[PDB]
Amino acid sequence: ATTRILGVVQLDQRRLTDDLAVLAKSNFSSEYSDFACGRWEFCMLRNQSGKQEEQRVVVHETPALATPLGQSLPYLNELLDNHFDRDSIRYARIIRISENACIIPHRDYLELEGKFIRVHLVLDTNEKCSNTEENNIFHMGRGEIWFLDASLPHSAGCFSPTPRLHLVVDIEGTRSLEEVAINVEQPSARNATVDTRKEWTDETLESVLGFSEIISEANYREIVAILAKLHFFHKVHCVDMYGWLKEICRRRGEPALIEKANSLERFYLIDRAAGEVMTY
Ligand SMILES: O=C(O)CCC(=O)C(=O)O
Ligand code: PRO
Ligand SMILES: [Co+2]
Structure with a gap:
């Protein structure tokens, strides 16, 4: 399991703009702020109970349920429905990084009885947003669905006036990675980013x-x-x-x-x- 693009989807900018406008005004969780350098934050779209109050993650066996926030984002709800297997989803979040903020270099899953398979669908980004892994730096582009090997040392930052939003899905950890992304186009090879x-x-x-x-x-x-x-x-x-x-x-x-x-x-x-x- 190497960090990589699993697939690419078409994003519908009109319907996306609408849900992004709601998220710009949404109450984001303060959980895991111990990991944030500045404004790195998320909100729950789907979790164990479907309740907005449930904002930390544990390994569990429940097909994740949409929160009230989840339900108020119908296009993002549709994407989740169409590009993943419902019963494999354990969480779905929106993770926003605002100007000159990052998540401190870390590994995930240390506090968890097991692991997730963590997947990012990029919603809104730009050239001054980066993710890093060990010695490498890369850009996850809009519409790309990436598997992130979060058990390796990694970080993510936004260095633009405009914030960066990724739809982040935690898939149950024993699922087959090749099977995770559904109804996706295979990405073509591209220029390496230097x-x-x-x-x-x-x-x-x-x-x-x-x-x-x-x-x-x-x-x-x-x-x-x-x-x-x-x-x-x-x-x-x-x-x-x-x-x-x-x-x-x-x-x-x-x-x-x-x-x-x-x-x-x-x-x-x-x-x-x-x-x-x-x-x-
Ligand atoms: O891109 C992000 O905001 C977070 C990256 C990360 O640390 C994660 O998804 O585990
Ligand atoms: O696994 C998670 O969801 C939290 C958020 C970043 C640090 N660990
Ligand atoms: Co992480």
Whole structure:
């Protein structure tokens, strides 16, 4: 299971515009804000109970049910009906990233008894929106249905004035990946997207490690966000931010900041429990 395009669909811009206008005014969940650097957020379209109040994810066996929000988005409802198997869906969300926001580099599923198969259908995006995986950066285009191997280190950012919205579907984890996307066109091969990021250098590295002189509890959040965003513009690994933070704090020499840095990396990449939240 490599991250890839499963298929491509035609989006109907008129009907899409209508549902996007409703989502622009919708109440988004604050759950998993511990993963957000800025305005990375989602809302529930389908979940276990069909209730708007149910906003965290667990592995379960129920064909997901449309929430009231779900029901008020009839075109997105239709897409879900037509391009996936109903009984295989466990969640469907809209995930929006607004200007200069990202989800912090992480792996998913650590707190879950099992995994999902995570699928993105891109609704509204642009050239300044990126997803990343390990050492790579790529753009998921409008109408593309992508399988995301969320068990690998990854992130996603939006660096445009305009927000980016993806329909994200969690399919029960033992399903056959080739069977997931229904009624889709096979994508043609295309030009590889070349990685336009800057080469990482000893200068850029020393500059980052220089924050050892100023890092404190008062600016920790800002520094973490800056570090998280670097791999969208420099050729470095998703996870390198955590090594940088650890070395920044080792040089600073304050025990509290070193412990936090260890916990940060651990929570996002190594180990966390069900319902556990990372406040930093
Ligand atoms: O593209 C996004 O907003 C989120 C990417 C991600 O971390 C996920 O879907 O697991
Ligand atoms: O798996 C999930 O849905 C949450 C959201 C991002 C981090 N983990
Ligand atoms: Co993820």
